[PDB]
């Protein structure tokens, strides 16, 4: 669940700690992740956290209760994903069509104790199952209302049709929309086709994708992405046991917005090679290189080396180093667009960064303890300083510790804490959870988050499971109503399902 540079959140994790709005509320508890309200990894800023859904990029994403696992990748091992990934990758993984029919609903409602703060109700479903020996489907969708504190609506739906062409091949057809109101409106639609083959010589995954997004204003603007993607994984035994991965991306984004020659385009080509090599049982060496060619901005090399060595049964060491970048977007690279103003800038350079990490983990008898040092050294962060202009920031450093501790206090009691500590050119967060499996069915959390001048915020949380079909969860957040961010608030959730 925790290792160096990488964190994993489970359905069971989310299910115990229902968010109020989006998954950022849970993802921010992972080591090296803050909200600044958008996800920020290892100090690097939001614009360098990359958000994929089933490995596909996207620019509440996914109903929490529909998420199977969230994978968080930080720092060097995340360079491979290109621009937007210098701080790392959040990868949100969904539930998938199944040989048997499957429904779930969820209702959740969070009521602030202060009427100043505004209440939330959200609501979602997932249906999945077979049609045919060769066809399977899965639909999920959500509706979300959040009153204005003295509101805002979201609706999304996404469908997947899955076709088993062969026992060794699957195509996925996907499509759906998200819509948001409150005036400010946004409508987004999405199409994808996916081929996954398992072959004698390894595996393959090709992706086509289209995204539109329209935004209305208190004038309209439309954005569209085309993507193509190929990835091979070929295990080899030559010299040493290893798994060669080869991958290519092609990417077009178009923007039309007559708040400013109203159209703007950009194409992206890339190759990457990672080779994960077993030098010896217990030692992993994993070089890789990624070429990103940008239509405005030329070429960007992102070479990386990562490695791991085991130190007996109970310890492991991990280090890596990698170059990474962020290319500017169409708003920032084009002087004709003015936002309120701030102006694009045709002579912008891409942010570059050299990200280094080194960590140890201990693991024994349900005990887990990791510490990781990181240091990122980055250049031309794009930043806003009358008519202002997007600019390149001068050099900077980030450096922290990530720690993760997990302690079984008893068979059905466990204590867990997650630490993030950085200096930039000296703050820390601590996220802790005391968990009690009182019964098979009954489950209890105390949770705290401590910022550091330092201050504290504690929640309590309870859950009961009647059956496969029904379960219930309820909780107080900000127990002690610490103010001078949200006050104390009561929430309650019900999940029905017919697996
Ligand atoms: C099944 C193909 C649907 C394509 C819709 C295109 C709308 C512009």
Swiss-Prot record:
Q: Which UniProt keywords apply?
A: Cell outer membrane, Disulfide bond, Ion transport, Iron, Iron transport, Membrane, Porin, Receptor, Signal, TonB box, Transmembrane, Transmembrane beta strand, Transport
What do mutants without this gene show? Deletion decreases sensitivity to siderophore-beta-lactam drug conjugates. In a pvdD and pchEF double mutant background, in iron restricted culture, able to grow in the presence of enterobactin or various synthetic catecholates, but fails to grow when enterobactin receptor pfeA is also deleted. In a pvdF and pchA double mutant background, in iron restricted culture, growth inhibited by 60% in the presence of dopamine and delayed in the presence of other catecholamines such as epinephrine; growth is inhibited further, but not completely abolished, when piuA is aso deleted.
The GO cellular component terms are: cell outer membrane; pore complex
UniProt xrefs under InterPro entries: Plug_dom (IPR012910), Plug_dom_sf (IPR037066), TonB-dep_rcpt-like (IPR039426), TonB-dep_rcpt_b-brl (IPR000531), TonB_rcpt_b-brl_sf (IPR036942), TonB_rcpt_CS (IPR010917), TonB_sidphr_rcpt (IPR010105)
Write out the function statement from the record.
Specific receptor for the siderophore ferric enterobactin. Probably involved in the transport of siderophores, including host catecholamines such as L-DOPA.
Entry's localization field: Cell outer membrane
How does this protein sit in the membrane? Multi-pass membrane protein
The taxonomic lineage of its organism, from the top, reads: Bacteria, Pseudomonadati, Pseudomonadota, Gammaproteobacteria, Pseudomonadales
| Single GO MF annotation | siderophore uptake transmembrane transporter activity
User: Could you confirm whether the keyword Transmembrane appears in this record?
Assistant: yes
Q: Its principal location? A: membrane
Q: Which PANTHER family match?
A: TONB-DEPENDENT OUTER MEMBRANE RECEPTOR, TONB-DEPENDENT SIDEROPHORE RECEPTOR PROTEIN
Sequence motif TonB C-terminal box, location on chain: 485-498
Homology family = Belongs to the TonB-dependent receptor family.
- Positions of the TBDR plug domain: 1-95
GO biological process annotations for this chain's record?
A: enterobactin transport; iron ion transport; siderophore transmembrane transport; siderophore transport
Name this protein carries in UniProt: Ferric enterobactin receptor PirA
Q: Locate the TBDR beta-barrel domain: which residues?
A: 100-498
């Amino acid at each position: 669940k925790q290792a160096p540079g990488v964190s994993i959140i489970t359905a069971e994790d989310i299910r115990k700690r229902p968010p109020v709005n989006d998954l950022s509320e849970i993802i921010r508890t992972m080591p090296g992740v803050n909200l600044t309200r958008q996800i920020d990894i290892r100090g690097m800023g939001p614009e360098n956290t990359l958000i994929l859904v089933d490995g596909k990029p996207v620019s509440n994403w996914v109903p929490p209760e529909e998420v199977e696992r969230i994978e968080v990748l930080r720092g060097p091992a995340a360079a491979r994903y290109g621009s937007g990934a210098a701080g790392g990758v959040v990868n949100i993984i969904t539930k998938r069509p199944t040989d048997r029919l499957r429904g779930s609903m969820t209702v959740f409602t969070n009521i602030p104790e202060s009427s100043k703060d505004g209440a939330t109700r959200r609501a979602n479903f997932s249906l999945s199952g077979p049609l045919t020996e060769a066809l399977s489907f899965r639909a999920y969708g959500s509706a979300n209302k959040t009153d204005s504190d003295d509101g805002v609506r979201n609706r999304d739906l996404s469908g997947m049709l899955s076709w088993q062409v062969t026992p060794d091949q699957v195509v996925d057809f996907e499509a759906g929309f998200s819509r948001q109101g409150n005036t400010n409106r946004m409508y987004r639609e999405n199409y994808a086709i996916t081929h996954n083959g398992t072959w004698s010589f390894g595996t393959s995954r090709f992706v086509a994708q289209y995204d539109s997004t329209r935004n209305n204003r208190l004038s309209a603007s439309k954005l569209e992405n085309y993507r193509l993607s190929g990835e091979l994984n070929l295990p080899l035994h030559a010299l040493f046991e290893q798994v060669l991965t080869v991958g290519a991306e092609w990417n077009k984004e178009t923007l039309n917005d007559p708040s400013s020659s109203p159209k703007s385009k950009a194409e992206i080509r890339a190759l990457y090679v990672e080779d994960n090599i077993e030098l010896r049982p217990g030692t992993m060496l994993t070089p890789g290189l990624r070429l990103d060619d940008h239509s405005d901005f030329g070429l960007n090399w992102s070479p990386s080396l990562n490695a791991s060595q085991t130190l007996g049964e109970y310890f492991t060491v991990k280090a890596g180093i990698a170059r990474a970048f962020k290319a500017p977007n169409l708003y920032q690279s084009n002087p004709n667009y003015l936002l309120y103003y701030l102006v694009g800038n045709e002579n912008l350079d891409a942010e570059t960064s050299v990200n280094k990490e080194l960590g140890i983990e201990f693991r024994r008898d349900g005990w887990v303890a990791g510490l990781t040092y990181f240091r990122n050294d980055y250049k031309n962060k794009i930043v806003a300083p009358n008519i202002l202009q997007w600019s390149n920031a001068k050099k900077a450093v980030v450096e922290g510790l990530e720690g993760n501790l997990l302690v079984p206090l008893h068979e059905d009691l466990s204590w867990s804490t997650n630490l993030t500590y950085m200096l930039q050119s000296p703050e820390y967060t601590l996220n802790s959870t005391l968990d009690w499996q009182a019964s098979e069915r009954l489950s209890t959390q105390l949770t705290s988050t401590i910022y550091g001048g330092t201050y504290g915020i504690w929640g309590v949380s309870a859950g009961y499971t009647f059956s496969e079909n029904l379960s219930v969860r309820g909780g107080v957040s900000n127990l002690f109503d610490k103010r001078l961010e949200p006050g104390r608030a009561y929430y309650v959730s019900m999940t029905t399902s017919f697996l």
